[PDB]
Structure formats: C-alpha cells, structure tokens
C-alpha cells in the first residue's frame, strides 16, 4: 500500500551523510561498529516489514522490529524506558532502533540465504528498486528457470504483483506465460525488467477515486485483463483467458507467444 514509509524517514535522515557514531547492543554485531565509522547510508530497501539499511561497504544491516521494534529520528544530542538496540549517528541526525530483536548484519551473500528475505522480494513501488536489479533477480538461479504465468504471481520474487498487472505487462512485451528469464534474449530480457516497474508505478501513481470512473476514464487502461472477447488494440485478435485456473490468465493469441 505506502506502509514503504518508515524506510523513507531514515533515509530522508542519514541517508549519505558519513557516519560519526556507530553503536551496538548485540555483543555479536560489536565487530562492525569501528568498520562503518566514515561509512554512509547508501539506502534502505524494505522487504516485507523488515528493513534492510545498506552501506557503502557492502555491508547490510537486516531488522524486524516485529511486536514491537521502532526506530526513531533525533538530533546528534538529543537523548526513555524503551531499551535501546541500534545508534547510527551522522554530524546532525541520528536514528535508533529501539525494542527490536530481530537484528542482523548480512553480507552480500547471506540476502539470497536467509530465512525471511528469501520469502519476500523488493517492492515494485520501492524507488531503490532498479531495472538493473530486477533482471538481476530474473537471471539468478532461483527464478532464471521459471514460468513467468507464476513467477509474476510469486511475492517471494517481487512484492507488489497481482494478477491485473501479470496479464498487463506480459503483453506490453509481448509474451505468453510459459517463458523463463532464461528462454529470452538481452533486449527481451530488458524489455521484461522495465515492464514489471513501469506498468506497476503507472497504474498506482494514477489510481482515482472509487467510482470515479462513472465520469471519467482512468489515463491507465487494461488492454488485456477482463478484455476477453474484445479486440486487441494491436493486431486485432479476439483476446482469449484461462479457466482452468489459479488467477484467470489474460492475452491475447495473436501478437503473444
Ligand atoms: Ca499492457
Ligand atoms: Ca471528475
Ligand atoms: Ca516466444
Ligand atoms: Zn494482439
């Protein structure tokens, strides 16, 4: 929905400012405490209702605030019952995580790996998220080889996804829902990367009002999705859809394949 808001307060914080003051209660993350000093924010990625803050060396740290973990904006200086777990201090902010437990720091490649992260991929509607990162996703070995019809249907792949948009952006490029990620050439593959974003971003930064469309057409229009039986405005094809089914798929028979 926009719950993506929490990881735009700590960015919108410290993120890019060189950190002054790092600070740990976990005696095992203690280690990268004098690491990350001269180290900055380079974002923060939401997964699910975690949150994975990046740094300029590679290094993640991963949380779950859970029940009831909550972070907190204040001033280098400003200093309550709560149990303090986190302290990133840049020269004017500074952000702390209080009352979580789920806490850890994750090298590059413990993301794939763990536990939580592989149940739930970046959000579409994640500005972080880059055409770049998603044909990473689509070429690694854990989707490379899977049929787009569920992939796009998959939330451990791409959070954000329903079905409404699987049909759409399957046909903006043109595409039946049997292809893997590996069955496409680069410029297929690139086509696909933007897609996913783009019709996902599209549709949502233009949604009215209900009922709104009682006088007046949405600028985002379906071309395939609950259009069974009508024309394609492409090649004209009588657009076709799946019972048989776990989500009614849409296309259209004559310019997908
Ligand atoms: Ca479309
Ligand atoms: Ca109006
Ligand atoms: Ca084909
Ligand atoms: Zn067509």
């Not at 930064?205 to 024309?231: C, I, M, S, W, Y």
């Not at 019972?243 to 004559?254: A, E, I, V």
Request: aromatic content about 8%; some cysteine.
């Amino acid at each position: 929905p926009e719950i993506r808001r929490a990881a735009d307060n700590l960015e919108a914080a410290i993120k890019g400012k060189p950190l002054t003051d790092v600070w740990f209660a976990f005696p095992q993350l203690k280690t990268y405490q004098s690491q990350l000093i001269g180290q900055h924010v380079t974002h923060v990625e939401t997964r699910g209702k975690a949150l994975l803050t990046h740094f300029s060396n590679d290094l993640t740290l991963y949380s779950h605030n859970q029940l009831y973990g909550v972070w907190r904006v204040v001033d280098t200086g400003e200093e309550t019952t709560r149990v303090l777990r986190v302290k990133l201090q840049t020269a004017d902010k500074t952000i702390l995580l209080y009352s979580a437990s789920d806490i850890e720091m994750l090298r590059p490649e413990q993301l794939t790996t763990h536990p939580f992260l592989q149940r739930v991929g970046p959000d579409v509607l994640d500005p972080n998220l880059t055409p770049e990162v998603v044909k990473e996703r689509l070429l690694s070995p854990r989707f490379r080889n899977r049929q787009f019809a569920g992939l796009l249907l998959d939330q451990a792949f791409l959070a954000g996804l329903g079905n409404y948009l699987r049909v759409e952006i399957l046909w903006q490029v043109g595409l039946t829902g049997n292809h893997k990620a590996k069955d496409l050439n680069a410029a297929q593959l690139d086509a696909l990367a933007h897609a996913l974003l783009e019709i996902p971003r599209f549709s949502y930064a233009t949604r009215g009002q209900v009922d709104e469309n009682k006088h007046h057409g949405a600028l985002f229009r379906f071309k395939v999705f609950h259009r069974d039986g009508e024309p394609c405005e492409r090649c004209g094809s009588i657009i076709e859809k799946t019972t048989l089914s776990s989500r009614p798929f849409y296309w259209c028979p004559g310019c997908q394949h």
